[PDB]
Amino acid sequence: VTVIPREQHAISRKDISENALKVMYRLNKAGYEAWLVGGGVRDLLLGKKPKDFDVTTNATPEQVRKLFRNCRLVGRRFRLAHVMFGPEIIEVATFRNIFGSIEEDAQRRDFTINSLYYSVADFTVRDYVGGMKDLKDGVIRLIGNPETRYREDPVRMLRAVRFAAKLGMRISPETAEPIPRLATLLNDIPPAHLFEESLKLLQAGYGYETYKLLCEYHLFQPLFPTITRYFTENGDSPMERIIEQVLKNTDTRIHNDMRVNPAFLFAAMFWYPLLETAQKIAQESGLTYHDAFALAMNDVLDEACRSLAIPKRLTTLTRDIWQLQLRMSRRQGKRAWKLLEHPKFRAAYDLLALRAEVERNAELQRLVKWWGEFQVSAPPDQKGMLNELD
Structure with a gap:
């Protein structure tokens, strides 16, 4: 036919x-x-x-x-x-x-x-x-020879996963085998070619299933070296569960014609990765936290960035998204108002929402409930919240 x-x-x-x-x-x-x-x-x-x-x-x-x-x-x-x-x-x-x-x-x-x-x-x-x-x-089909068609353009590997994910439809026995093996091949593809075929995958509003698949084909591995290193076997980490929700939300936030911030998913996963980073460097070298963090950010970026070229636009934001995580922390007599206005704010909090729930930490969740109220308050209430702390 x-x-x-x-x-x-x-x-x-x-x-x-x-x-x-x-x-x-x-x-x-x-x-x-x-x-x-x-x-x-x-x-x-x-x-x-x-x-x-x-x-x-x-x-x-x-x-x-x-x-x-x-x-x-x-x-x-x-x-x-x-x-x-x-x-x-x-x-x-x-x-x-x-x-x-x-x-x-x-x-x-x-x-x-x-x-x-x-x-x-x-x-x-x-x-x-x-x-x-x-x-x-x-059923998913490469047109010709798997073995050839990837060595030729390994990017074809990803689209292939990408599509089985959007549609509740499965790959092909023959088209499927090659990848776990060739997988790695990606490494020589310019990082930003990767960085684009990345978004296309999961911040496509299909993410969760897309990664369910990617992980399983040791395809996740190459793009997020930085990350994969922190998975656990059991399957229950925060890092692990966090990305499960951040995508689940995105799958949904998109399925509901709403702008999603691109920079956000990224600072979204790496939190922990950068976090476990920030930690070791902190002690393993004589230096204060505000400082220690600073580089923590650079190397997770230079490292992951090296794995896939991230726009300065994206990074600069993702940087900010974090640094606030550390400001929403210091209950401030009157600086609150300031942060409140900050352009990149909503994300900062959006994270912390997630953050306090995976970590299943009380003194964070306690805090989120607070920024929750204090951000929708009028000024007569906000005026007063800041007065119960001092």
Whole structure:
């Protein structure tokens, strides 16, 4: 099977395809035939709506700059041109001695249920791989040779986990074996390539299950060297349980169209890691705490950062998120108000929420309940809280 006729494939309905579909006609008219793939297709066959509308035509990124010479075309780099609508953008990649048959760009892509094609001209899809059965039975497929396809681009390992996680559907016996083994290979991939395929995974609002998987494929290990070192066997650490909730929350905080702070998940895991760090250096060298901490932060970062390039933006925040953890501590006669205003505050507290619950520490939980009240107070109450301490 390498095709399915209009009505026979889960009623695609030219209907749930967008303004995006609009573009497909200035192509279907000016010459070339245009096919949409992956992001919408995979989703849409199940029926579930489309996340991004990714187009793919034979017309070269030039005939295309030459065709929509008009439209607010944007986005440099080979092929990959982004034509704009507004709250809807449409990626435009051409097939790929460099270019060729769409079937040709079939083999360059990575997964079966992730790459099925169709034009408004045909109302028919195109299965150049077992794509439709993989979708039918909920199963993950690299297109070609596992062994090759990763050594070639080990990043393909991660997407593969990434996807089995979003969908309550399982990987493939053959596609699956390689990784525990090759796993490590990632190490030579620039840290920031890693750092991006990282967020994409768990701060995708799918995290918890994604990591349930990653850990188990000793894939977690490479990105978070810094961390894995602190797991325990039993399975019950704070570090361990903490990340279980911080993701669980995020899975949820996202499933509820709410902005989540990126910097937050990171300072979120490492707390302990940096914490156990901060500890040893503290005594093992003559120096005071406020100080000791300072470097504690640098090395967990330089270390983990070395494992995956973290934006100065992110770090600078994550730094702050912590340093407050140490200010929310010193019940201050009147400095409270100050911290209260601090830009990066909500996270600081958000952490401490978690923090006091995993650690199952009373004199923290005691404190969180306090900042809890004192932050929603008016000023007549806040005025008074600060007066019971002195």
